[PDB]
Structure formats: C-alpha cells, structure tokens
Design an enzyme around this catalytic site. Structure first.
Site, PDB file in Angstrom:
ATOM      1  N   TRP A 215      18.875  56.338  24.537  1.00  0.00           N
ATOM      2  CA  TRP A 215      18.301  54.802  24.152  1.00  0.00           C
ATOM      3  C   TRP A 215      17.921  55.014  22.665  1.00  0.00           C
ATOM      4  O   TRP A 215      16.961  55.509  22.068  1.00  0.00           O
ATOM      5  CB  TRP A 215      17.025  54.659  25.109  1.00  0.00           C
ATOM      6  CG  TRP A 215      16.494  53.376  24.764  1.00  0.00           C
ATOM      7  CD1 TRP A 215      17.108  52.264  25.113  1.00  0.00           C
ATOM      8  CD2 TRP A 215      15.043  53.103  24.730  1.00  0.00           C
ATOM      9  NE1 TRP A 215      15.954  51.117  24.971  1.00  0.00           N
ATOM     10  CE2 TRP A 215      14.848  51.721  24.760  1.00  0.00           C
ATOM     11  CE3 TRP A 215      13.913  53.907  24.493  1.00  0.00           C
ATOM     12  CZ2 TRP A 215      13.443  51.321  24.727  1.00  0.00           C
ATOM     13  CZ3 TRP A 215      12.579  53.448  24.453  1.00  0.00           C
ATOM     14  CH2 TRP A 215      12.507  52.215  24.500  1.00  0.00           C
TER      15      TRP A 215
ATOM     16  N   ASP B  59      10.155  60.553  29.589  1.00  0.00           N
ATOM     17  CA  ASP B  59      10.290  58.842  29.548  1.00  0.00           C
ATOM     18  C   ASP B  59      10.722  58.493  30.779  1.00  0.00           C
ATOM     19  O   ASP B  59      11.888  58.963  30.990  1.00  0.00           O
ATOM     20  CB  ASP B  59      11.215  58.543  28.214  1.00  0.00           C
ATOM     21  CG  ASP B  59      11.727  57.177  28.314  1.00  0.00           C
ATOM     22  OD1 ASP B  59      11.034  56.438  29.091  1.00  0.00           O
ATOM     23  OD2 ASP B  59      12.215  56.642  27.173  1.00  0.00           O
TER      24      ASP B  59
ATOM     25  N   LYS C 144      11.308  47.682  34.828  1.00  0.00           N
ATOM     26  CA  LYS C 144      12.239  47.754  36.017  1.00  0.00           C
ATOM     27  C   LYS C 144      12.168  47.594  37.770  1.00  0.00           C
ATOM     28  O   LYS C 144      12.482  47.034  38.328  1.00  0.00           O
ATOM     29  CB  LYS C 144      13.426  48.689  35.755  1.00  0.00           C
ATOM     30  CG  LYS C 144      14.105  48.352  34.113  1.00  0.00           C
ATOM     31  CD  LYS C 144      13.200  49.253  33.241  1.00  0.00           C
ATOM     32  CE  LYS C 144      13.921  49.167  31.732  1.00  0.00           C
ATOM     33  NZ  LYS C 144      13.329  50.240  30.885  1.00  0.00           N
TER      34      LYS C 144
END
Lengths: 396, 396
Positions: free
Chosen positions: A130, A211, A246
């Site tokens: 990312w 993460d 999410k």
C-alpha cells in the site's frame, strides 16, 4: 507566500475514478475501486450498523468530548478481537489502546510517537504494498525501506528473498507486517511462516508494527489473527494499527485503533502517556459516532451475531468472485493460468497484466484497472463477469 | 524500546477533572470545564442536531469514503459563514476549504502544510492564550513566539504593547489571531483595532492565521466575523481554522475546517493540492457524521432557524451569567471591582485570583478553577451563584 508552491502529484485511484466517471460507454467496469461492493455494485450500510445508529440516536444525551484515547469499551473490545479473550497480554494489562481516526490515523499516530519518543529512524515495508505507507512515515521524518515479499514471476511469497532482505535491517528498526489480506498481493504467510518470522524478529531486535485493516476477510475473525497472535506471544513490545472501515463498512466515519504493547503495565502506561501527547497535538480527541457504533455492536450478543453474519457474506462474496473469475477466464479461452487468484485472500490481487494491456483494456473495452495490473475482485459481479473476461482474453 | 520513555507531563484540566470527581463534598463547583453547560449543568445535544441525525439515519445509503477535503456543501456553507455570502473571495474562487477533525485538526493541518510547502519557521501566538497552540505548531517543527496582548493589571487589551511586540516579527512569519472570544481572556479587539492590525499586517508581510472557534458567541454570527472579514479584504493570502464543536455542541464528532486563501484561483488550487497531500499523510479523509449534520442544518431553512435560536440561547446564558456574577459579588461584600467581567466575550475569563487563592477555594470551599485563575462562566448557574460568590469573598 504560496506563489511558488508546486502542485502535488496525483493518487492514481482518484485520477482513475474521474476518468471512469467521464466515460460515456455503457459496459464500463471499475476494478480500480478501493472499497467493498455487493452483487448490485453498491457499498451499503450494514444492517447491524443502521441498528446501532438508531440506538445511539435514541440514547445519546451529550456530545461532550471523549478522552484522548476515546471510548473505553471500544478499547477492550478491540483488544479481545486482536488478542482473543483470556490473553495474558490482556490479563497482564500490557496493552493500551487508543481510538483513532481510521487505520491511517493509527499509523500516523504510531509514527509521530516513535519519531519523538524512541531511537527509531527506519521503517521497513514490504514491496508491492500500500503506497500510502511511505507518505505517512516519511511525514513523521522516518526513513522508509523496502523488503522483498512478492514474486511477480510465480505470483507468490518468496520467503527466501524475504528473510534475506530483512537481514539488512538493524536492531531497533521497525518492520511493518500486514496482519492478513496483504495489500495488494492478497498473499499471506502461513502459520508456520509467521512463527518463523516471529522467532527471527526477536533474535534481530526488530520492532514489529502490524497493519490490520482486513480482519475477517481471509478466513475468519480468529483465524486472521493467528500471525499477530504468534508475534504477541514472543514479543515484549509491539504496535498494532487496526481499522474497522472494511469489516464494519464504516469507511467515512474514520474508525480505527492504535494498540501499544509493552513488557509490563508500568511501562505501557508510561509509554502510552506520550502517545496521548502525540494525539493531543494532532486532532486532540477522536470522532465518537463510528466508534460508538462498533462498541455497541461488539458488546451486544444480538447485534454482534447479525454483524458476524454480514461479514461472512462479504468474505464469501469475495471468495465466490475469485473462483468465478478464474473459471470464466479458462472457459472464455484464457491463454494463461490464473489459478493463483484462488490462493489469494481479500479484495486485491495482481492480475499479471502489463501496463500496456491495462491501457488497452480501458481505451478499447471500458474496463478500469490500476496501471500495476491490480484489480479489486469486489468490483466483479456474476453479471459483469463474462464481458470482463472476454475483454481480458482479447488483450492477452 | 520503550524502557526509558519518560512520562508525558499533565494537562491540569484533565488533572482537575479527576480531582473534581474524587471529591466527596456536596456543594462542589467546577469552573475548570472547557465546554458549554446549561442551567442544569449539562451539555446537551442540540435539538436541531438530533433532527439532522434523524434525517441521516433515514437517508444515508452508504458510508463510502469522502473526498480528501470532505463534503462539498460543508465547504461552501463554511465559506459563506466566514466571509459572508456575496463575498468577492467566494465569487473570485480564491478560497478552498477542507473538512477536518475539529479545530485542532485544522490547526495541525495548516501547520504540516506550512512546514513542508513554505519558508515559514515561526508562529506568533498571543500570551495568556490557549496552551495547545504551542504543541500543535511545535509538532510540525515550527517555532512558537509570544506577543503581548493581555494586561493582567488593568484586565484589558494593551494595544500598544501588542503593536510593539509584533514589530520584532519578520516578514514571512505567521501571526495567529483569535477571530472572537479570545481564549482565555475574553478580550477581543474593536473593529477599528482589527482594521489597524490588518493594515499593519500587509505592510509587515505577515501571514495571518485565524483561529475561529467561537463564532456566534460574542455578539452574533455575522458580527463575530468583522475582524476576519477586515483582514480578508486587505490580504492576498490567509488561513482560517474554524471549529463547530462549541456553536453546534458537536464536541466529540470532531467537526472543523481549514480554509486557505490565495491571490487567485490557480494559485489556491495549486496550494490546496499540497494541503490535501498533508491530509492524506495524516488521517486520509475526514469523519462524515458531525460534518454531515452541520451541512444539513446550514442548508435547510427550517433547521437553520432552530439552530440560530439555540445558539442565541447559549450566548445569552453566558452574558447573563457574567452580569449575575459581577452583581452577586458586589452584594456579597466584594472587595475588588469585577466589572471588567462584563466587558469580556465568551465562556472564559481570568478572575484575577491568585494561585494561592485558587488552591484555597478548592481546598476549603470545593470551588474548582485553573491555577491561572481562569474560570468558565458557563459553569455558573443562578443556583450556585450565591455560594460561589461567598466562597470567593472569603478568600479576597
């Protein structure tokens, strides 16, 4: 004062979006999206969420400031989710959690904290990861290095190149790991590989930073936490930046958490104090809505049951699409093997398409994807599967 | 890695609160609060807000990410509130607004922006000001200086000492002004004084940065904006950090804005992009709930009417409490002249009490205030006025 300021570059995604929009074609397909999408192609509000919001609407009596670390129950629920209930980290009071403005916010807070309260100067991030990780850390004045992870040839985790590249990292350096659903390869390590990294990490004096933005999207809530849990069992210190964007579909409410783990209570409390100081200097205290929803759901047997089911539906939707995509490809006369798509978790994967193939797909077929060949499988529908696969086949 | 981390010092308000709570006394009174409170001693959710939340619950269909700058209507509504509708700044498209996690968040963003995109190195803040200003700017690696403002002897604005300290500030330096309701003196410059500062600012090459957190708390919505409006008419560049925490009672939802003003449209756009980059590296995008509520109210004629009245009621409660405070002191056998209390705007004021007097009030009377003698008038009620004043008299 602003006369000479040079324009910031782009962020391909938003750029892709606008291009998508301004496209008069009919069969257009956007695979460059960064969020979950249902069979109808929308990003709905979860039923459990809507229910929780009704509850808040009827019970909230004030909007008074939350503590710097936010809602307490949000913190304990988050910890249980990460470490599992009955965990020693918990019973030992070795972890402190701060409610933050989304996962990115958690990352930034950890970054500012490390930069001013420790000797950290470098953060190692996996390759094909990312891109926002770089900016966040760099912004805090930290050096960002890349380790080998993904194998663009075999489409897999090159564990050797990995362990090998991570040997150039020093003690006191931070190493960032994706808890599950690696962004954007979809390739995660096996439990055994996790245990190996954990052992190695302790041996090398690394500070692991996890993460965790897709808990529940690979296999399940608990399963997805195996890796992290493997590390936590071996480390004295650890940092976790989690997101609820999410798995709760709360994207725009900025819901996340930053978890600090120390050798002991006394130490984590002293260290957490400086984390709060970092927060106070940033946004002061966190947004209540999104986090209140999460705490309300996670603490209600009924609502929690409903939410777990909604998450399962999402996970299964994705697994179905990956499978359906590979089959339709083979059927439509696919030149190459795409079976690797089935071995990858989450919404993202690298299709293996060349930059030129991607350009062609869009210009000629109205199919949108990132120049890196990355695709969001949640952008696929049983409905658009066929036209999509025929287009791809045409460019191979 | 966290073994030698020193504990962050305290934040007396939060330290005061804890002490306040742990007090078994009956007539306790907390004047150390930082929020508005009603005649019943509570911080309620505004009626207009509850109505807007109902509306969102029924109409929201997704929680998909907002743009980096947030809700567009929130932006245009904020600009009108600041510069007034029909403002040339607006028609000329010279301002860009970014939705941020509260006023503090806006400050932090401006700071990061300035630090990386300009040659700014110093920021001048008034004395007797909001302490958090220092931490925010220092965090971005900016130098913080102090200018003379408050006159602790005469309890007033020493315009001379002010103009005098600001002379030592060089061109390219940023000067921070409180739009209205100076925190925490309650002393604001007059329109004529604002105009003088504006002329001087242009002449000296300063970059004005307005911290506007109490709009509508001094005289009214439009009135409270004269100062900023006076500056805007003379400058090419300017920055405004506004907050809706107090005027909308949306404390915990983190609703604020950061407005950038440039010479022209091309310039502000180019500069705004670097501001977005700074946001992206921080929390990514803003929390929707609070800001959505603000945009709904501000854009709906009916709701806006209701909110304006609620805001008026708050402002009036305060002016009433200030008046009642001075009067009750006077009849309680007050030694000193407190009449200056009636000339100050907002929730805050320096009572002129000594550190020792403050300590005694709490130890002996249960009255709570900051060691600096700062008091929150919204903490006063027609009910607790008498005792509060008798206690004060007993320590003069």
């Amino acid at each position: 004062m602003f006369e000479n300021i040079t324009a910031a570059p782009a962020d391909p995604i938003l750029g892709l979006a606008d291009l998508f929009r301004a496209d008069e074609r009919p069969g257009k397909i956007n695979l460059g999206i960064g969020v979950y999408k249902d069979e109808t192609g929308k990003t709905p509000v979860l039923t459990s969420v809507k229910k929780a919001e009704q509850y808040l609407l009827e019970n909230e009596t004030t909007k008074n400031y939350l503590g710097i670390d936010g809602i307490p129950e949000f913190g304990r629920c988050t910890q249980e989710l990460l470490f599992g209930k009955g965990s020693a980290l918990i019973n030992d009071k070795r972890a402190r959690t701060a409610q933050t403005p989304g996962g990115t916010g958690a990352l930034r807070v950890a970054a500012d904290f490390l930069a001013k309260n420790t000797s950290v100067k470098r953060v190692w991030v996996s390759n094909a990861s990312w891109p926002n990780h770089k900016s966040v850390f760099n912004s805090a004045g930290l050096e960002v290095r890349e380790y080998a992870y993904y194998d663009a040839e075999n489409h897999t985790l090159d564990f050797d190149a990995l362990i090998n590249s991570l040997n150039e990292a020093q003690a006191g350096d931070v190493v960032l790991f994706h808890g599950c659903c690696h962004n954007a390869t979809g390739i995660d390590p096996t439990l055994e590989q996790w245990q190996t990294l954990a052992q190695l990490s302790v041996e090398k004096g690394w500070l692991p930073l996890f993460d965790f933005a897709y808990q529940g999207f690979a296999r399940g809530l608990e399963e997805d936490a195996e890796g992290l849990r493997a590390f936590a069992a071996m480390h004295k210190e650890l940092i976790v930046a989690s997101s609820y964007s999410k798995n709760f579909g709360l994207y725009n409410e900025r819901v996340g958490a930053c978890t600090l783990v120390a050798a002991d209570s006394e130490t984590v409390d002293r260290a957490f104090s400086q984390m709060k100081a970092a927060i106070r200097a940033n946004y002061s205290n966190p947004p209540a809505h999104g986090a209140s929803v999460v705490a309300t759901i996670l603490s209600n047997d009924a609502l929690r049951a409903i939410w777990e089911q909604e998450l399962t539906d999402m996970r299964q939707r994705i697994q179905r699409m990956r499978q359906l995509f590979v089959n339709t490809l083979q059927e439509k006369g696919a030149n190459r093997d795409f079976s690797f798509i089935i071995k990858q978790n989450g919404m993202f994967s690298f299709s293996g398409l060349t930059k030129e193939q991607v350009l062609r797909l869009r210009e000629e077929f109205g199919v949108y994807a990132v120049a890196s060949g990355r695709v969001n499988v949640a952008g696929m529908t049983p409905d658009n599967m066929a036209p999509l696969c025929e287009a791809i086949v045409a460019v191979l």
